[PDB]
Amino acid sequence: PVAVQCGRLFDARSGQLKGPHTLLVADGRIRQVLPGARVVDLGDKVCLPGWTDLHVHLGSQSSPQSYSEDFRLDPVDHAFRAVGYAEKTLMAGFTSVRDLGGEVSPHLRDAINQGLVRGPRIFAAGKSIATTGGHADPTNGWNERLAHLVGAPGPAEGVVNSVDEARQAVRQRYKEGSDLIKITATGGVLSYARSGDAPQFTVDEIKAVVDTARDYGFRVAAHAHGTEGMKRAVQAGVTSIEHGTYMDDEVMRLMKQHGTWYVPTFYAGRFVTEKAAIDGYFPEVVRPKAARIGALISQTAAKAYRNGVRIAFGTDQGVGPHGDNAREFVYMVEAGIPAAYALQAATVHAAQVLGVDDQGVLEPGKRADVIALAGNPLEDINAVLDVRFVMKDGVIYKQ
Template structure:
């Protein structure tokens, strides 16, 4: 009986795509290549992919037709920085000692569905040790969620941000053993290469490093450099052998500079990015993923006594407000920007708040939407399949009522969600 109920629950989102044809009539379509609206268009979806986009399509017998003529249709949104395996709470630090992997796994299923229903059909999960399993379950149609590119365990240095032994007693640390490359903790270029190969062994889709201290880690500094440049270069070179891109968590100026100079593909957060670093990023073509939402959220919560440990609060209060200012400078300077939020540091499903914060900092609404479509797809090296409503690409389509290029707050109210030709939400 329980198996039958499970199968019945899965049918609505696993049995629709194969052999199906759907026509979607849109009042406007967002042209992600040129960051503008095209006017009325009809989209023909066949077997999960976009077959054609035209000004009009004749009625076809037996073919489902979805009326979104009062809506703007956009490519499925892409969040380039999430953590689906966790979510903020005052209990988060203690839960690390109490919860089991299956507890986190069950929670992540709900986080994934909230993300999808918010219009984010693809995400890059940066640092979840168990996210490969969630990715596989979504790909197999077992649970509802976005397409996931999973980094697996972040690569850190000994004692650095993402060292899993930070903040615990010596006795407990000794019982758990010294963390090494298999645990994502390295000291020197040789161990750095080994850690990349371990992530390949575990089935990761990309590599993430923690190039500087972190705001929420149980340590004093949130911005000190934590890798030597030769260690980062070893990671980047090894990653290239496996077709991996490298994302670098980095707050402090020197840590950002080392990561960019060593060839990483993206800087995440970039809080204290200097003019010198901005010039280097433009020279190297390095992407910037700002995560303003996380900065604003941690600053708000740090003002609440007891939400974060006392060692974390000063970092959150200092770093949080700075990220939005840095983003504005980077945008004005012409740095390549891809949308990313750090969801998990704040509540999953609230990802679209980032659009409003980007616009507040000076980015036009159309460019902000482009950052979550074309730009993010290019960063993920998936532009051939994602990021625009174009024939041949996956039918990842979302819609909002009205014109989001005129009112960016509409991005918080996605009413239609299709991923790979399957409808998950309707107006």
């Protein structure tokens, strides 16, 4: 039964900064909000709902030695790093994340739920689904000896090639304890492959994936750079599109008609463009793809916003350093997107993408995930980079 007094309250449902309020928190939920028991005072601070990041990779972080860790490290080391990664992510103001790839994230989610370690609320997609030679193929770039003694990956490993294998892949993701489904619709930038935007899925396989996920109650997110794969994924019926580098007018029309969410991820594109300039940071197979593709994200996102495509907040951290997600807000504001909409996209739209209702707005009966800022973020977006108070589920983690 705590009473949090807030000097200025942000209404994520309306996007307008309100006056002083008081929140009553009991049993991990918000009991009532009163205009104007222990007391937590934030009279000279701005209170907001906890932020949600819809694209993170908490079990990795990009580094010069990243491409050699596949043959030298074990999952235990990745978990020991993910402890600090999750603590840094939680302390930055993000009380919820959607992890879109990795086999360490379900275990970290279980550990956080059991209270062994501190971190945000994780919605884990598990191992991503791809095709042979795809962006998420685990054996791209391996020589013939290792490839032969490791075999050809199949539905149990996440590699699909037919309609009947997609069903088995979705069922195996459900069996391993996933919360949603992730597919790579086209090629990628950071993979050890040749293509970067070629359509790597047929419409039948994506439709099978969506049908199986709907049978199991899952939602499907699709990584996509090229136009043909993006159009195939949109027409199949996926929920969100992870990148839109080569999005055109017809894809925008189809997205608006279907209701697809768009996750721009400015931060990853800026990071790959910056790191492609350093010699030796990326393999020579990867460097041209990054230097070309990554620089065409801010314009497409601005055009999609101007055309009326629903946009959500996601960072693709794991390329960039964890605990620095809030910088994307700045990248949004300097892209033509108003600060109010940028703050809305991480609170009330992220819950719509996630398909839940118990979070996103500071309303009675919802989860008590509250954060505080020293400065007003509407008149100056940089104030999102200094969080002074973090509370999750009624437990204060930063005062």
